[PDB]
Amino acid sequence: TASVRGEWPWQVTLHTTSPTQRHLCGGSIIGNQWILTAAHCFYGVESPKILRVYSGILNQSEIKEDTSFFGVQEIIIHDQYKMAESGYDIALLKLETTVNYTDSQRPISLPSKGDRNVIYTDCWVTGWGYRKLRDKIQNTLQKAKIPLVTNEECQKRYRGHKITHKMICAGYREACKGDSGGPLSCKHNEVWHLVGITSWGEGCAQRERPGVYTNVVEYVDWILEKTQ
């Protein structure tokens, strides 16, 4: 179902302007000039010069040639990243300017290292549904409440690959529209945490293999060090 204006204020849409402007990936505001996304997003990206970050966007259609955007100064890919299935599918975007927090643009708290093993029960996946080369982007930002799936249950489904500790699985929902690099956000003790980053896997429905997310809590050290 459809999201409303101001519901997911940490959610951003990342655009490329080369050759033409189009939605490239999802991402989350994690600080004044820090966007957390997936490293696989940048397979075709040469330099940050071609990127635009749009905050406070409900509809892709509302993006015009007068719409305020954040320029990207640096693309930080995790140095151990090779492909999504081998993990380390995480990246930071250092913006050119600082994000001045409003009700339409605010940051999402990273997960607590004390809540490493906590089984979150209020998780959401949001995006414009861009995960494949041929898929058509959703105009309005979509949301779906997704249950977490244990790494053991996840490994059983993906016998061909290795489901590491640095991965978190979500699915077996009672079709999802997360974007590559998009957030898997869980509300714990009435506070939103960025638990996952959409990486690989099939989908969220009961009839699908679960989505494999970058387990944000395992990268808290990496994120703080890079944003220091």
Epitope: P19, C25, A38, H40, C41, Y43, G44, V45, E46, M83, A84, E85, D89, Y130, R131, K132, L133, R134, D135, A175, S180, S199, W200, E202, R207, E208, R209
Partner: antibody, heavy 122, light 109 residues
Framework: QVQLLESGGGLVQPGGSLRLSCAAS????????MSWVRQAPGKGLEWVSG????????YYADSVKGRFTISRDNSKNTLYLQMNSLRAEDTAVYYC???????????????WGQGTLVTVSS | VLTQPPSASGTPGQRVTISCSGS????????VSWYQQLPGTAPKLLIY???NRPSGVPDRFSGSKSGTSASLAISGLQSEDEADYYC???????????FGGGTKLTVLG
């Protein structure tokens, strides 16, 4: 292990119709995006159509839009290509293949069938 | 539209490079794959995501990419390697997966 067995290929008159099939084994069919890729005699490869795991989304090359229809039966582990108003330039071996097309993977075909030759001749 | 030389050649135990020319819309900004097609058989995935080998593809095959071009290197050339080799990439501008016309590799000696 993984098998993709094709059948339904043969000779057809110009303007004729044919239903190609591809039976799968050794992987959970419903989880896979499936495609048809053809190869005209002594030529290279050309993607024809693709279909998602559920069957919700279907895609077609420009040369076959409104003539070919792709479908699947997940209970039967089978993929279909209903081809209508066949033309001489549709003469090729048609292979079914499991495709990967995520932004994370790139666009590739990891498992291929053996192919069925489709001949469109008067 | 990916362009490959129609033919390539080498003697046993040599290295042969099969080349693939493209553009900014395909190779220039997309993951490259390579297929081997032995006479009268279906294609087989040799390389995916530029340099990765699927399970069972020997170390002898290596993929690389530099700008709008991609290369398949076949080291320790065997007579069994005599096949058609195809490069492939998604093309954002055409909005379709594209293939090279293939290179027919001949083993001499």
């Amino acid at each position: 292990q993984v098998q993709l067995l094709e059948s339904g290929g043969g000779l057809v008159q110009p303007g004729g119709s044919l239903r190609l099939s591809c039976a799968a084994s050794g992987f959970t069919f419903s989880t896979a995006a499936m495609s048809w890729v053809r190869q005209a005699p002594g030529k290279g490869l050309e993607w024809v159509s693709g279909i998602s795991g559920s069957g919700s989304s279907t895609y077609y090359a420009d040369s076959v839009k409104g003539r070919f229809t792709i479908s699947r039966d997940n209970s039967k582990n089978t993929l279909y290509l209903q081809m209508n108003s066949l033309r001489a330039e549709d003469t090729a071996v048609y292979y079914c293949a499991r495709e990967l097309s995520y932004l994370y993977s790139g666009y590739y075909f990891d498992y291929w069938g053996q192919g069925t030759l489709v001949t469109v001749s008067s | 539209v990916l362009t490959q030389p129609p033919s390539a050649s080498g003697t046993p135990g040599q290295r042969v490079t099969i080349s693939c020319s493209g553009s900014s819309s395909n190779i220039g900004s997309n993951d490259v794959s390579w297929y081997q097609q032995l006479p009268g058989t279906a294609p087989k995935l040799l390389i995916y995501k530029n340099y990765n080998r699927p399970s069972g593809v020997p170390d002898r095959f290596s993929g690389s990419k530099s700008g709008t071009s991609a290369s398949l290197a076949i080291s320790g050339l065997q007579s069994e390697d005599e096949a058609d080799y195809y490069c492939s990439a998604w093309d954002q501008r055409q909005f379709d997966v594209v293939f090279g016309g293939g290179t027919k590799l001949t083993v001499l000696g």
